[PDB]
Design a protein around this nucleic acid. Structure first.
Lengths: 60, 155, 85, 125, 116, 49, 148, 134
RNA sequence: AAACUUUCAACAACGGAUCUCUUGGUUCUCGCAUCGAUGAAGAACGCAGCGAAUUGCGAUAUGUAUUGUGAAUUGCAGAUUUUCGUGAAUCAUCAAAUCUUUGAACGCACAUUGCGCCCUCUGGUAUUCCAGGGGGCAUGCCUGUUUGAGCGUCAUU
């Protein structure tokens, strides 16, 4: 689950997730928070575990 | 557009100047309008035009010292105080009295030399205004003349 | 009930957020700002409105450009760069 | 005064001083240089800097001296080592001091401090 | 952190790699930021990114100027912004340019100096 | 409203974040008078647009 | 309204005069800027005078005909006789005034001599190279007054 | 003529100004033509105009316009002046020929009340001018 | 007689007068002439290690570059050794840039972060579909440009 820049499509995200983390994105669901920033909720395919890649990026 | 500046007749003005330069003589008038002129050896106090040469303040004070001021220059030094007003916050923060007035005919640095001395208002005879000669409209500012200037009053 | 009860029936919006001055003064059943007369090209402003010049002139805002012309005039509209001493 | 590009207006001066930027303030925070040093360097006064070497001359702290952590250009002060109030709890807070009180005794040397001195008209280092 | 003059030497491929090295470290920081109260490193590294970007642009634009140097009609951003007025108003060539009649007149009758 | 415009949500997004009190470390700044935040808008008390 | 044997003042303040009041506080400080700009001319100009040499002319009317006075410029008669061109007269700082005509031999002689005394008293700097200056006299009217 | 717009003739005010009809826009028809083409051809600078024809309905004016952007002008000093910024919309200010007539700007005794400029002379002679010394 | 009411004191409240201050005004003088389609003024949303406002700036976001100065900043925290240096700084300066969304506002719209079309490139089997990166597409007028239109009109096969 990311915070994302506004003015960023669901394609633009999928691409950036795949490009950064070399992950296959199942599906993005964005929303826009009351605070006024986007928040993606990106799903990874069966193959990629989210738990490991979470401690790989940093946030446990 | 209220009337700030007030016209005066040229002639009246001259009269008043003249009449101030009367008062520059007569000790009685001069002693009332301040001025420690008890040590001085009589008034219409003219000094040579050798003072007219003077360049530095040190030498100008040294002239006044020996001439008969210094009782006047101590005056204007001790006299300084803050204003008793809001005028403090309109660039009048301090007062201090008027010392003597060095008239002269010619400038070879007199203007500069006396400049920094805290009482001495120099002034040309050429001008010699009543603003400088009878301040507070009290006749008889103690004038230190020069032998040139004092000669030139007749002209 | 021309008062407290008919105020109840106030639940719409004559006006909304005008593009151009971000006031809530963009009438809608007229498509135009009451404040700034957007979408007409000039700013809807008057002399009679003395204050409401004051509320929106050059300097009320940032002047992202014009904050910095005076300088460029003073240096004489230079170009390029300095070097050394 | 004599020139017309300068103000006897108090109201403007004070504005300037209190709003003056760090770049200016550095100058306003000159300390005079000691009776010793002035004869060595022919310089009455330098802008005070981070390495200190300074005998306080006016105040409760006069006589006492030290080095310094930091110049507080924002408070126009200079905090000083040893010169401290002690709060009731036992913690030590630095005393603020205005530099023109404070007198420099062992200048910090740098190309730019030497250069400043050479630029100001100073013999020796 | 990174100094301008050091970047200035590096090539266009070098800088893009350099930028990516920073943008990773920036990213790893904003992950560390949320788990810690204060993270002030972030500011200096975010400047570098700019430093680089500025250095990239500056090279790019000097290189465009390098091609258009000589020819008329360089891009609008590479002309002098000046101020509309001036940028419209007659150039010191023009205006000083004087009709052939008035040229002659001037030559036969220039304001000769004269004392007394 | 619920069925809101984005130009509306963005301005509320402003006005949610604005409403937060004066962060207690500005109180310690040198030459500070701001003891508390004035511009502070309870959702009942005062409205927005 | 109105009053005791008091004269009929006609005063004009029924319009919004207090908007259009102009008080010359400047006066004294304007003078300065004139003196200063007259000087800046004199340096910019350099050897020449500030004024072009102007001719004598008898004022018009019954009221003033008895007086003589400085006119605009010199006429293509008075110049031609004094021995130069209007085109050139302008280069040497004589005010030419095409539109004045000359119906009085006792005024022309006044002028023609005046031009002859001017062309005399001035020197001209060669265009080619050397410029031997002899200071600037700031006004022609100083050196060439209109004596009646 | 100009019709004073006013709804329905309801002028409102002193019957002097009840006049709606016989009312005569003080800028000519020439000028209005120069002006209308000015705003159309904003880049152009009116220089002068001249009458062609008329009829019942219309006067017709040939308006001569000049392009200060264009170079043939900007270089050659005979026209070059018109490129200066103090000739932007000469027609609107009344710096055209028609304009200067309609402003009432000749020399002489028959044109006092406007000569420098109508609103000028007024604002000179409807001023109280007070010195330091009165 | 107390309580109470009233008057008056000292001390204490309430309250913020008076005094004194003053980075604000104020008028007066002097000097200058410099906004914008090269996107101005204005607005919106953002951006700080810890900011709500202010101040600054624009996803290079309380700044980058350049130059100067020559060690700060400072509420705390924090660096970094750059402290005999192409270098500290909420410094000055400022000529290189960046300059989100807007706004005269310009692809067409605009109570919408809507809807296109074109060129180019990269993804997905792709000239056409989608997606991503870039660069575009306003109106008037002007000068030319090429392409045309009218038995308006001339001269020829």
């Amino acid at each position: 689950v990311f915070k994302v820049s506004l003015k960023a499509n669901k394609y633009q995200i999928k691409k950036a997730v795949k490009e950064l983390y070399e992950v296959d994105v199942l599906s993005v669901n964005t929303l826009v928070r009351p605070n006024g920033t986007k928040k993606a909720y990106v799903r990874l395919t069966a193959d990629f575990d989210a738990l490991d890649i979470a401690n790989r990026i940093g946030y446990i | 557009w209220r009337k700030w500046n007030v016209k005066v007749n040229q002639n009246e003005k001259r009269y008043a100047t003249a009449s101030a330069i009367a008062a520059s003589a007569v000790p009685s008038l001069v002693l009332a309008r301040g001025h420690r002129v008890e040590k001085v050896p009589s008034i219409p106090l003219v000094v040579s035009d050798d003072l007219q040469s003077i360049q530095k303040t040190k030498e100008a004070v040294a002239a006044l010292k020996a001439v008969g001021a210094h009782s006047d220059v101590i005056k204007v030094v001790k006299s300084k105080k803050l204003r008793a007003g809001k005028g403090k916050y309109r660039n009048r923060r301090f007062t201090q009295r008027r010392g003597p007035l060095v008239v002269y005919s010619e400038d070879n640095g007199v203007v500069k030399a006396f400049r920094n001395v805290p009482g001495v208002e120099t002034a040309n005879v050429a001008s010699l205004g009543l603003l400088q000669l009878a301040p507070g409209a009290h006749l008889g500012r103690f004038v230190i003349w020069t032998q040139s200037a004092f000669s030139k009053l007749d002209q | 009930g021309k008062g407290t009860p008919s105020f109840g029936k106030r639940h719409n919006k004559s006006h909304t957020l005008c593009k151009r001055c971000g006031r809530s003064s963009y009438h809608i059943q007229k498509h135009t700002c009451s404040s700034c007369g957007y979408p007409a090209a000039k700013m809807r402003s008057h002399n009679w409105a003395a204050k409401a010049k004051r509320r929106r002139t050059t300097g009320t805002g940032r002047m992202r450009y014009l904050k910095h012309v005076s300088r460029r005039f003073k240096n004489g509209f230079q170009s390029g760069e300095a070097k050394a001493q | 005064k004599q020139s017309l590009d300068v103000s006897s207006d108090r109201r403007k001066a004070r504005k300037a001083y209190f709003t003056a930027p760090s770049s200016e303030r550095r100058v306003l925070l000159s300390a005079p240089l000691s009776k010793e040093l002035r004869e060595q360097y022919n310089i009455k006064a330098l802008p005070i800097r981070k390495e200190d070497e300074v005998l306080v001359v006016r105040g409760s702290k006069k006589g006492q001296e030290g080095k310094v952590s930091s110049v507080y250009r924002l408070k126009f002060a200079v905090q000083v080592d040893k010169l401290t109030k002690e709060k009731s709890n036992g913690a030590s807070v630095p005393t603020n001091i205005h530099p023109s009180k404070v007198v420099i005794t062992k200048l910090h040397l740098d190309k730019d401090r030497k250069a400043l001195i050479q630029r100001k008209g100073g013999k020796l280092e | 952190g990174i100094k301008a003059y050091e970047l200035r030497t590096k090539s266009k491929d070098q800088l893009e790699q350099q930028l990516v090295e920073l943008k990773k470290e920036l990213a790893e920081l904003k992950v560390q930021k949320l788990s810690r109260p204060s993270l002030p490193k972030i500011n200096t590294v975010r400047k570098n990114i700019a430093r680089v970007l500025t250095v990239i642009s500056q090279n790019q634009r000097q290189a465009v100027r390098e091609l258009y140097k000589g020819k008329k009609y360089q891009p609008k951003d590479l002309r002098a912004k000046k101020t509309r007025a001036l940028r419209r108003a007659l150039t010191k060539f023009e205006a000083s340019q004087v009709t052939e009649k008035q040229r002659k007149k001037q030559i036969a009758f220039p304001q000769r100096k004269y004392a007394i | 409203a619920a069925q809101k415009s984005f130009r509306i949500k963005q301005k509320m997004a402003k006005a949610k974040k604005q409403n937060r009190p004066l962060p207690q470390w500005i109180r310690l700044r040198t030459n500070n008078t701001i003891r508390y935040n004035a511009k502070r808008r309870n959702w009942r008390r005062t409205k927005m647009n | 309204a109105i009053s005791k044997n008091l004269p009929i003042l006609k005063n004009h303040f029924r319009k919004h005069w207090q908007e259009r009041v102009k008080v010359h506080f400047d006066q004294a400080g304007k003078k300065v800027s004139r003196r200063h700009a007259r000087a800046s001319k004199a340096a910019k100009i350099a050897p020449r005078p500030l004024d072009l040499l102007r001719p004598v002319v008898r004022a018009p009317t019954v009221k003033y005909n008895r007086k003589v006075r400085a006119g605009r410029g010199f006429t293509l008669a008075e110049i031609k006789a004094a021995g130069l061109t209007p085109a050139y007269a302008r280069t040497i700082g004589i005010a030419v005034d095409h539109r004045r005509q000359n119906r009085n031999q006792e005024i022309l002689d006044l002028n023609i001599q005046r031009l002859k005394e001017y062309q005399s008293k001035i020197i001209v700097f060669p265009r080619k190279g050397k410029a031997p200056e002899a200071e600037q006299t700031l006004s022609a009217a100083a050196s060439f007054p209109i004596v009646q | 003529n100009r019709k004073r717009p006013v709804s329905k003739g309801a002028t409102y005010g002193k019957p002097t100004n009840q006049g709606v009809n016989q009312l005569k826009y003080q800028r000519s028809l020439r000028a209005t033509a120069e002006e209308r083409v000015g705003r159309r051809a904003a880049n152009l600078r009116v220089l002068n105009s001249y009458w062609i024809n008329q009829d019942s309905t219309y006067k017709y004016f040939e308006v001569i316009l000049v392009d200060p952007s264009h170079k043939a002008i900007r270089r050659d000093a005979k026209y070059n002046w018109i490129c200066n910024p103090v000739h932007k919309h000469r027609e609107a200010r009344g710096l055209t020929a028609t304009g200067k007539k309609s402003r009432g700007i000749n020399k002489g005794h028959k044109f006092h009340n406007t000569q420098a400029g109508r609103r000028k002379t007024w604002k000179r002679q409807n001023t109280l001018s007070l010195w330091r010394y009165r």
